[PDB]
Each structure stands twice: as structure tokens, then as C-alpha cells.
Amino acid sequence: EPVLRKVELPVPTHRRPVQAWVESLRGFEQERVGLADLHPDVFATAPRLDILHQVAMWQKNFKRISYAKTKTRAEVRGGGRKPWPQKGTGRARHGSIRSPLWRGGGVAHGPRGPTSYYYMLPMKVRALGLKVALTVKLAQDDLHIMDSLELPTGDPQYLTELAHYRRWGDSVLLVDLTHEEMPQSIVEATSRLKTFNLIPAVGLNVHSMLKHQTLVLTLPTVAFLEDKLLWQDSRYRPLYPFSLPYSDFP
Amino acid sequence: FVESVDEYQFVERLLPATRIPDPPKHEHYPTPSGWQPPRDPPPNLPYFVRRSRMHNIPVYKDITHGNRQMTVIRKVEGDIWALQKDVEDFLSPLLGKTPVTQVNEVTGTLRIKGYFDQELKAWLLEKGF
Amino acid sequence: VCPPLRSRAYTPPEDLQSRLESYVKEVFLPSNWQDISLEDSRLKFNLLAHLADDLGHVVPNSRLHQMCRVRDVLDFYNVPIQDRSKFDELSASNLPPNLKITWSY
Amino acid sequence: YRARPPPRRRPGPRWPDPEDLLTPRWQLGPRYAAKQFARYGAASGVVPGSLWPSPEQLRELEAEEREWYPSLATMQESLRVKQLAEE
Amino acid sequence: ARALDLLRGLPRVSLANLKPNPGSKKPERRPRGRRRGRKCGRGHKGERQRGTRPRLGFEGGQTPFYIRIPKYGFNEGHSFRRQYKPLSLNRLQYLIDLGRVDPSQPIDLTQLVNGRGVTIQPLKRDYGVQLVEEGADTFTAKVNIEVQLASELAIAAIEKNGGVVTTAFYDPRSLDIVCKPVPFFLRGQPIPKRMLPPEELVPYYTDAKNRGYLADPAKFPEARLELARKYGYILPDITKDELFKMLCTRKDPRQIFFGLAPGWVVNMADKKILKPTDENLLKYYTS
Amino acid sequence: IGIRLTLPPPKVVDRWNEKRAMFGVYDNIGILGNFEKHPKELIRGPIWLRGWKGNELQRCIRKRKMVGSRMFADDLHNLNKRIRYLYKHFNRHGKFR
Ligand SMILES: [Mg+2]
Ligand SMILES: [Mg+2]
Ligand SMILES: [Mg+2]
Ligand SMILES: [Mg+2]
Ligand SMILES: [Mg+2]
Ligand SMILES: [Mg+2]
Structure with missing residues (x-):
């Protein structure tokens, strides 16, 4: 029985939903167990590689906290007294043995304290980056939809052989709806693999999508991502943080 | 001291919506405020100009340096070059010269020197976008 | 049990139109079968899965949305693809006698 | 590998121990309890009766209102006398 | 789109292929080399080159311009002046047309904010919304709108359309x-409780010509007839309108929300409303 | 002679250690989790610069404000002196004015 997925959210009239093969991990040859219609606004948007770069750099940098620090001439030990008088010694004028010129002195313009690089791109920009990453994977034939992540066995060799047979990349990012419900078989298979990384739907990101050659999604994950990303489109300007109650926002 | 009750309808009324509501169906168009929904089916032109999330034509005035006046048609899909040709044809009689424009194919936007927001909005409404 | 890796090379069969129309009749009839629209997910899946199973070459997800008609399916399936590495592609290209290519990979 | 469990908000109310010296003072007052009740309903464990002012607080509020927010009749009388003086 | 076909043709997009949009990253200029070194753009020796030029506004000892101009009360009491966000009838009609404001129910500041028709900043001394006559000639909506200020022409337009404004x-x-x-x-x-207007604002909200929420309702028909006579339209008897109940609904002067009384506690967690029953609390919240 | 005469020991980097492999996960916790948690809440670091950024003067002011009471004696003295010096530098020195 084919597994056919339709687009729950409304699709623009001028656009037709893109399509993908719904596969399964239960067998090496089960490369087509159904057909999924994917929202064009999420899986066929423009190839915004500039937005991809923006979001990837934001992800790399906003968490960064450089702990590099150096002692200025005020913080270097000692160096209070004037080494020698201004005139008479025939030597250069100096005020302390800890000025930047001296060996062991302070650093004039070194790194100062733990520095944060935190900044936030607009949430619309970040959602657009996620959409662009998904569309890039689909257009480059690195996106594979699965009915479920259930495996016949939890042996990592099975998963690696399946990926190699199906010609997946050296790195695979599997995504499941929620952390709690992820199958034990796939959990065991991916816990022992380095290039096969399994994440919940909430953990999807541009950086990992780009790091991993292929992206594997389940049908519930596809629906969840479509809903969440399309919500950013056609949403009001916030009155207050969305964590607070809204009339129609779960 | 404390007495609970279920009159939460008057609180659900105050709860605000997160999603922009779809415009209600009107018996006659254009609507008193001038708003008009896109025609169904969409026009078969090589390009498409998607409405903004508020359901308005994505035509915006822009100003830089305090003297560079421009108009931007933003949410364009399809043949942005066909849209540029059509805009030039429609605007040249008004200016008397072919308007100078930038076709940002990457962003899918068209920028035109000078203020033509109202004229372009009316033109796109006529075209059915 | 792991089946051996399937070579990506695909040369269109000679009786490709006949095979395709037979499959179309099996799945779906009217004249000009080339223009039968695949707007129905069930029919599109049946036709494409049958073709992939028979020819050992499936429509990628990237081109899946573009198969709007049996004509599009025929166009996709009548274009060959060769998986030979660039080394082979260069060596077996009538290299002149004074050109020697060696690969250390 | 498998990702660590996604970070989640601590479910239910959060009640710091008053005995601890490091607990911030704002986390011990009645306003914190009121916010916890608003956020988590009856699961907060906050007695709803505490939300309204205690009689002393009500007396203070009434005194402040009498002092600073005059009645409509008083405002109208003041305006009337001011207008009479101006005329 | 042909762009996606080009992507299919092109190599895989990875972290080694990313590039910022050209023109979005100006080169960093630092004082090294012949062109940017030596004096590093600071000029010849002097106070400015040493980096100790006088404060902004200093004029070398001549009395500064901004100190030789006399003080005038241009901004005196600015932080205490009341501000009202304008809400033109054009904007109101646009919101009603797009369905972001429902005219079938009473329209108040809460509904306007929820529909995003206006942004209110109480911290910036915004005291509410003022109706603005702009767009009056093209206003064709029957609405029951509550505002803080209202122009005579805006009231006239609202009432001519058969609506009510307070x-x-x-x-x-x-x-x-x-x-x-x-x-x-x-x-x-x-x-x-909703506090009463300050003494200065009491006459405005007690005057019927402004449709003040504290004004005598007996004088409202006279004022409406005066406006109708002035602006040349026939006053519609809203009592006959099927929505007369909605048009008549008005919150109590001490009531903030239409259906919620002062003193109630809204438990949103379990969808409940706790109402005090103590006599002292009830008296206080009714006062 | 300020050049090493031997190649440095080869630097092997495991691009697929758990940290790199799972880097960035939950960066979209907000937009993909009903905004229960802000992405800045994923930041681990000094308490005074979690989800915040500023120049050196602002950083020092925030540090003194937030953990100044817990700072050691000489560290706090150095921070006070640094704040004073940075105030003088930013408010009295510079090319532009
Ligand atoms: Mg010292
Ligand atoms: Mg040192
Ligand atoms: Mg601008
Ligand atoms: Mg020079
Ligand atoms: Mg000079
Ligand atoms: Mg003098």
C-alpha cells in the first residue's frame, strides 16, 4: 500500500507542491514505499545561499564567548615606581617597567575579558534560512523522506551498509519528530556512529544540515517542519513573546 | 472568600491572534478602503507578484541619501526580466524616457528610480496580482 | 544480506515507448497517451515505481515534481546516464599518442 | 551519535528554599507567589485568598485613593469653583 | 524555477561553499602599510592627532552656539504631556476591510491592539488613541468604537455611518x-479599577459633544442631531438596527474590560475567574 | 633564526567528534519549539554576558554590577580601575567627537 502524503497547509494557487519519494529503513531495497507532497513555500523557495551563509555564521558565532584575556600595564604586577629619572641617565624616558614596550610589560591592545559575540538574526530570517536549506537539499537530491526510522536491527553495520547501498553521503543527519518516541533500534544504531547523527525535529539547523551530506526526514517531521516554518509566514507582528498565551498559538 | 466561575469567554475575547486573518469576502470590490483581492485564477504571465502577509501589493517607496527616490516591487516570482520589460513599457510614456531599474534576480526584486508606488500598485491590481 | 552496489549507468531501452505505454495502460487509454496528466498521486506513484523497478533507474526527488506528464516521464527515461569515473571518461576518449594520464587514487 | 535531550522549561512551579541565603529576595515575596499562581493555576499550590489585599493592605489602598484620587463630584466642584473665579 | 535546476547541476552546498552576499561585508581598514600607516589618518601633530580635542560643542573658547542661544520652554513638561496615537478613519476602514477588526463587536483599544491597527506605548506617555478625520469622506462602516479623543468630524462620520463613538x-x-x-x-x-480622569480632563469626558463616557446620556441625542444638521446627513435611528444591543454596549467607567469586573483574578492556566466575596473587597472594587 | 628547523608534530582534527557532529543542534529551539526557550538560553558562559553583548566598558560595568560583590579583592580593584580608565578613554579621547 503506497504511503501518500498530502500538504495539510494551504498552498499558493500559482505554485504546485513539490514531490519526494517516501522510503523506509526496514530493508535495503525499500527505496520507494510512497510519495509525499511537500509545500512549495518550504521545499522550493529561492536558493538563498546568502541567507544560508547568514544563518550559518549566526549559529557559529552567537554562542561564542572568547575567554582570551591579557593583563594591561595597570594589571601587570609591580611597575609603580619610575625606573630612573627623566634626565641625567642618558637613557630613554620611562614611567614603569610594565609599559607595553618593556619585556614582561602589559599588552596595549590585547583581548579584554571574556567577550560575547551574541547577536540575533530576525526569527523570520532564521526560518527562511531553514527553508532554504531544506530546498537546497531537495534540489540537490540529498533529502530523503522516511515513513519511520524503525530499523530491523540496532546494528550500526546495517545502517552504514544501507546508506552505502542507497548511495547516501558519507554523513547522514536523521531527524525524528520528538526525542522520546524515537525508535530504540535507530537510537542504538546511531549511538555508535560518528557520521550518522540522529536528532529530534526541534534540533534541526542549517549548520548541521550543511555539515551532513544527506538529510533524512520522517513524514511526521516533514509535517512538523512545514507547519512551524510556514507559521512564520502570515503571522502578525508580535505583541509580546510567543511563549505567552495567544488566541491560536499552541 | 474565593469564588471561582467560568466566564472565560470575556478573556478569550481579549486573547490576541498570532496569525493574520484572511480578509473577509466582500460583495463588491474594490473595498471602500481600495483593497482588492488577487483574481482567481492567477494570471498566466511569465512572472508572479505575491501579496504581502497583510494581503497588499509588495510595492514600496524607498529613499537613500535624502534625494534618491526609488520604488521596489519585492515579492516577484518567475521571469523578473519579463516583469522589468513590462514595467519599462508601462512607465516610459509617463516619464517620457525608459526608466532606469535594477533587477535583483537573487532576491527576486525590481527597483526603479523615482516614486511610482501608486501607479505600480494600480497597474499590478489591473494585471491581477 | 547486502545486495551489491547498483551501477548508476542507464542506457534507455530500444522499446522504451512501447514499454511505457504498456505500463500506462496497466496503471490507468485515451488517444495521445503522451499527454496523460500525472496530477494524481496514486497513479504517479504506481507508474514511477513500476518504471523504476523495471528499468533499475528511478526519478530523483529533484526531478519528481517536473514529471507533470507521461511525456515528461518519457523524456526523463530516454536520456542516458553513465557512472564511469572521470579517469575512465578521460582515458577512453581517444587520447592522442603524446598524452598520458595516470591516477594515483 | 544521538543528540542530547532537547532543553525544556522546568515543568510546574519553581519554589526556592527560603532558608538558602543565595536565593534572591524577589523570589520569596508574595509577588512571586502570585506570578506562580497565574502561570500554573491550582498546580502552584498558592492559596487563592492570598492574591487579594489583606485588610491592612486594603486600608492603605483606600487611604491612598482618598488622598490622591478625588471623587468625580469633588473634581466637578473644584472645576466649578475655578470657573466661577476665572469668570 | 531554473535556479533549482542550476542547483541540481552544481556541486553540493556545504560549509566550504558559503559566501556572504557581495557588498554586505566592507573590508576592514587598519593602519598598516604605506597608504594607511605612518600617521594613520590622524594628520599632523596637534590636539586632535594626540586624540584630546575638546568636547563636542566646544568652540575654542568663544561662547558656544548652544549656550549663547537663550533657554526657552520648548520641552518643558514634555514627559508629562499626554500623547494620543492617531487612528485615521482611513486606517480604521482598512482594518475593518481586511478583517483585522470585527465591527460586529464593540471596538475598543484592546481590539485595535489585537488587530495591530495601532501601537500603544504607555511608558512613553501614550494615553490612548485619538480618532482622526482623515478618510472621513470614504468611511462606510457601522462600528461601535471606544477611543480616548475624537475629532468632531470623525464623530460625525462614525455616527453618519450608523455607528456609535464614545x-x-x-x-x-x-x-x-x-x-x-x-x-x-x-x-x-x-x-x-479604572481611575477617573484628572481634574483637567474631567470636563472633556463629561461633555456630551465629545461623547464623553462620563457625559449625561440624555444630552447625546441633541449633540448627534446638532452634528447631523451641521454636516448635512440624516441621523439614523440606531435603535431600529438589529445590532442596536452591540452598539449600545458600553463598559462601566470603572471597568477595564467589557465583561470583567475589578477585583477578579483570571486564572488562565485552568480557564477560571476567581471572584472575591469578602464584603470589604467587594466594596473597594465597586468604589 | 626565528623559524623552526623541523616540521611541527602533525595536527589531527577529528571533524566528527560528538561536539562537532552535534554543534548547532537546538539553535532553532525557539522557532521549532513554540518559543518555550529562547536560543540565547542555550548559551553557557559567564553569568554577566549570557545573551548580551557590548564593548569593553559596557562589559566591565555589567561584570561589576552582576558579580562585583562576589569578586576577589584585587580583581575588583582592577575592575574598578579598568572601568575608570575606559570611561576616561571613551568619553574624553578619540579622533571623532
Ligand atoms: Mg600600577
Ligand atoms: Mg606578563
Ligand atoms: Mg529604506
Ligand atoms: Mg599617501
Ligand atoms: Mg594642526
Ligand atoms: Mg575669553
Whole structure:
């Protein structure tokens, strides 16, 4: 029985939903167990590689906290007294043995304290980056939809052989709806693999999508991502943080 | 001291919506405020100009340096070059010269020197976008 | 049990139109079968899965949305693809006698 | 590998121990309890009766209102006398 | 789109292929090399080159311009002046047309904010919304709108369309609660009483010509007839309108929300409303 | 002679250690989790610069404000002196004015 997925959210009239093969991990040859219609606004948007770069750099940098620090001439030990008088010694004028010129002195313009690089791109920009990453994977034939992540066995060799047979990349990012419900078989298979990384739907990101050659999604994950990303489109300007109650926002 | 009750309808009324509501169906168009929904089916032109999330034509005035006046048609899909040709044809009689424009194919936007927001909005409404 | 890796090379069969129309009749009839629209997910899946199973070459997800008609399916399936590495592609290209290519990979 | 469990908000109310010296003072007052009740309903464990002012607080509020927010009749009388003086 | 076909043709997009949009990253200029070194753009020796030039506004000892101009009370009491966000009839009609404001129900500041028709900043001394006659000639909506200020022409347009307009006062606290009720409910405090207008504003809200929410309702028909006579339209008897009940609904002067009384506590977690029963609390919240 | 005469020991980097492999996960916790948690809440670091950024003067002011009471004696003295010096530098020195 084919597994056919339709687009729950409304699709623009001028656009037709893109399509993908719904596969399964239960067998090496089960490369087509159904057909999924994917929202064009999420899986066929423009190839915004500039937005991809923006979001990837934001992800790399906003968490960064450089702990590099150096002692200025005020913080270097000692160096209070004037080494020698201004005139008479025939030597250069100096005020302390800890000025930047001296060996062991302070650093004039070194790194100062733990520095944060935190900044936030607009949430619309970040959602657009996620959409662009998904569309890039689909257009480059690195996106594979699965009915479920259930495996016949939890042996990592099975998963690696399946990926190699199906010609997946050296790195695979599997995504499941929620952390709690992820199958034990796939959990065991991916816990022992380095290039096969399994994440919940909430953990999807541009950086990992780009790091991993292929992206594997389940049908519930596809629906969840479509809903969440399309919500950013056609949403009001916030009155207050969305964590607070809204009339129609779960 | 404390007495609970279920009159939460008057609180659900105050709860605000997160999603922009779809415009209600009107018996006659254009609507008193001038708003008009896109025609169904969409026009078969090589390009498409998607409405903004508020359901308005994505035509915006822009100003830089305090003297560079421009108009931007933003949410364009399809043949942005066909849209540029059509805009030039429609605007040249008004200016008397072919308007100078930038076709940002990457962003899918068209920028035109000078203020033509109202004229372009009316033109796109006529075209059915 | 792991089946051996399937070579990506695909040369269109000679009786490709006949095979395709037979499959179309099996799945779906009217004249000009080339223009039968695949707007129905069930029919599109049946036709494409049958073709992939028979020819050992499936429509990628990237081109899946573009198969709007049996004509599009025929166009996709009548274009060959060769998986030979660039080394082979260069060596077996009538290299002149004074050109020697060696690969250390 | 498998990702660590996604970070989640601590479910239910959060009640710091008053005995601890490091607990911030704002986390011990009645306003914190009121916010916890608003956020988590009856699961907060906050007695709803505490939300309204205690009689002393009500007396203070009434005194402040009498002092600073005059009645409509008083405002109208003041305006009337001011207008009479101006005329 | 041909762009996606080009992607299919092109190599895989990875972290080694990313590039910022050209023109979005200006090169960093640092003082090294012949062109940017030596004096590093600071010029010849002097106070500015040493980096100790006088403060901004200093004129070398001549009395500064901004100190030789006399002081005038241009901004005196600015932080205490009341501000009212304009809400043109054009904007109101546009919102009603797009369905972001429902004219079938009473329109107040809460509904306007929820529909995003206006942004209110009580912290910036915004005292509410003022109706603005702009767009009056093309206003064709029958609405029951409550505002803080209203121009004569705006009232005339609203009433000619068969609607009702009332000017209601809101202290800063009540205004903040009205504009953002959900955060107030999360504060877990009983709904406070709406304070009366300050003495200066009392006459405005007690005058019937302004449709003041404290004005005598007996004088409203006379004022409406006066406006109709002045602006040359026939006053529609809204009593015959099927929506007369909605057009008549008005919150009590001390009531912030239409159906919620002062002193109630809204438990949004379990969808409940706790109402005090103590006699002292009831008297206080009714006063 | 300020050049090493031997190649440095080869630097092997495991691009697929758990940290790199799972880097960035939950960066979209907000937009993909009903905004229960802000992405800045994923930041681990000094308490005074979690989800915040500023120049050196602002950083020092925030540090003194937030953990100044817990700072050691000489570290706090150095921070006070640094704040004073940075105030003088930013408010009295510079090319532009
Ligand atoms: Mg010293
Ligand atoms: Mg040192
Ligand atoms: Mg601009
Ligand atoms: Mg030079
Ligand atoms: Mg000079
Ligand atoms: Mg002098």
C-alpha cells in the first residue's frame, strides 16, 4: 500500500507542491514505499545561499564567548615606581617597567575579558534560512523522506551498509519528530556512529544540515517542519513573546 | 472568600491572534478602503507578484541619501526580466524616457528610480496580482 | 544480506515507448497517451515505481515534481546516464599518442 | 551519535528554599507567589485568598485613593469653583 | 524555477561553499602599510592627532552656539504631556476591510491592539488613541468604537455611518493593562479599577459633544442631531438596527474590560475567574 | 633564526567528534519549539554576558554590577580601575567627537 502524503497547509494557487519519494529503513531495497507532497513555500523557495551563509555564521558565532584575556600595564604586577629619572641617565624616558614596550610589560591592545559575540538574526530570517536549506537539499537530491526510522536491527553495520547501498553521503543527519518516541533500534544504531547523527525535529539547523551530506526526514517531521516554518509566514507582528498565551498559538 | 466561575469567554475575547486573518469576502470590490483581492485564477504571465502577509501589493517607496527616490516591487516570482520589460513599457510614456531599474534576480526584486508606488500598485491590481 | 552496489549507468531501452505505454495502460487509454496528466498521486506513484523497478533507474526527488506528464516521464527515461569515473571518461576518449594520464587514487 | 535531550522549561512551579541565603529576595515575596499562581493555576499550590489585599493592605489602598484620587463630584466642584473665579 | 535546476547541476552546498552576499561585508581598514600607516589618518601633530580635542560643542573658547542661544520652554513638561496615537478613519476602514477588526463587536483599544491597527506605548506617555478625520469622506462602516479623543468630524462620520463613538479615559496603568491584557493576567493580580480622569480632563469626558463616557446620556441625542444638521446627513435611528444591543454596549467607567469586573483574578492556566466575596473587597472594587 | 628547523608534530582534527557532529543542534529551539526557550538560553558562559553583548566598558560595568560583590579583592580593584580608565578613554579621547 503506497504511503501518500498530502500538504495539510494551504498552498499558493500559482505554485504546485513539490514531490519526494517516501522510503523506509526496514530493508535495503525499500527505496520507494510512497510519495509525499511537500509545500512549495518550504521545499522550493529561492536558493538563498546568502541567507544560508547568514544563518550559518549566526549559529557559529552567537554562542561564542572568547575567554582570551591579557593583563594591561595597570594589571601587570609591580611597575609603580619610575625606573630612573627623566634626565641625567642618558637613557630613554620611562614611567614603569610594565609599559607595553618593556619585556614582561602589559599588552596595549590585547583581548579584554571574556567577550560575547551574541547577536540575533530576525526569527523570520532564521526560518527562511531553514527553508532554504531544506530546498537546497531537495534540489540537490540529498533529502530523503522516511515513513519511520524503525530499523530491523540496532546494528550500526546495517545502517552504514544501507546508506552505502542507497548511495547516501558519507554523513547522514536523521531527524525524528520528538526525542522520546524515537525508535530504540535507530537510537542504538546511531549511538555508535560518528557520521550518522540522529536528532529530534526541534534540533534541526542549517549548520548541521550543511555539515551532513544527506538529510533524512520522517513524514511526521516533514509535517512538523512545514507547519512551524510556514507559521512564520502570515503571522502578525508580535505583541509580546510567543511563549505567552495567544488566541491560536499552541 | 474565593469564588471561582467560568466566564472565560470575556478573556478569550481579549486573547490576541498570532496569525493574520484572511480578509473577509466582500460583495463588491474594490473595498471602500481600495483593497482588492488577487483574481482567481492567477494570471498566466511569465512572472508572479505575491501579496504581502497583510494581503497588499509588495510595492514600496524607498529613499537613500535624502534625494534618491526609488520604488521596489519585492515579492516577484518567475521571469523578473519579463516583469522589468513590462514595467519599462508601462512607465516610459509617463516619464517620457525608459526608466532606469535594477533587477535583483537573487532576491527576486525590481527597483526603479523615482516614486511610482501608486501607479505600480494600480497597474499590478489591473494585471491581477 | 547486502545486495551489491547498483551501477548508476542507464542506457534507455530500444522499446522504451512501447514499454511505457504498456505500463500506462496497466496503471490507468485515451488517444495521445503522451499527454496523460500525472496530477494524481496514486497513479504517479504506481507508474514511477513500476518504471523504476523495471528499468533499475528511478526519478530523483529533484526531478519528481517536473514529471507533470507521461511525456515528461518519457523524456526523463530516454536520456542516458553513465557512472564511469572521470579517469575512465578521460582515458577512453581517444587520447592522442603524446598524452598520458595516470591516477594515483 | 544521538543528540542530547532537547532543553525544556522546568515543568510546574519553581519554589526556592527560603532558608538558602543565595536565593534572591524577589523570589520569596508574595509577588512571586502570585506570578506562580497565574502561570500554573491550582498546580502552584498558592492559596487563592492570598492574591487579594489583606485588610491592612486594603486600608492603605483606600487611604491612598482618598488622598490622591478625588471623587468625580469633588473634581466637578473644584472645576466649578475655578470657573466661577476665572469668570 | 531554473535556479533549482542550476542547483541540481552544481556541486553540493556545504560549509566550504558559503559566501556572504557581495557588498554586505566592507573590508576592514587598519593602519598598516604605506597608504594607511605612518600617521594613520590622524594628520599632523596637534590636539586632535594626540586624540584630546575638546568636547563636542566646544568652540575654542568663544561662547558656544548652544549656550549663547537663550533657554526657552520648548520641552518643558514634555514627559508629562499626554500623547494620543492617531487612528485615521482611513486606517480604521482598512482594518475593518481586511478583517483585522470585527465591527460586529464593540471596538475598543484592546481590539485595535489585537488587530495591530495601532501601537500603544504607555511608558512613553501614550494615553490612548485619538480618532482622526482623515478618510472621513470614504468611511462606510457601522462600528461601535471606544477611543480616548475624537475629532468632531470623525464623530460625525462614525455616527453618519450608523455607528456609535464614545471617548473614554484610561489612566496609564489601566491603559497598559488594556493594551496588553495577557501579561497582566500572568502577573496574577486582581483586575484593578479604572481611575477617573484628572481634574483637567474631567470636563472633556463629561461633555456630551465629545461623547464623553462620563457625559449625561440624555444630552447625546441633541449633540448627534446638532452634528447631523451641521454636516448635512440624516441621523439614523440606531435603535431600529438589529445590532442596536452591540452598539449600545458600553463598559462601566470603572471597568477595564467589557465583561470583567475589578477585583477578579483570571486564572488562565485552568480557564477560571476567581471572584472575591469578602464584603470589604467587594466594596473597594465597586468604589 | 626565528623559524623552526623541523616540521611541527602533525595536527589531527577529528571533524566528527560528538561536539562537532552535534554543534548547532537546538539553535532553532525557539522557532521549532513554540518559543518555550529562547536560543540565547542555550548559551553557557559567564553569568554577566549570557545573551548580551557590548564593548569593553559596557562589559566591565555589567561584570561589576552582576558579580562585583562576589569578586576577589584585587580583581575588583582592577575592575574598578579598568572601568575608570575606559570611561576616561571613551568619553574624553578619540579622533571623532
Ligand atoms: Mg600600577
Ligand atoms: Mg606578563
Ligand atoms: Mg529604506
Ligand atoms: Mg599617501
Ligand atoms: Mg594642526
Ligand atoms: Mg575669553
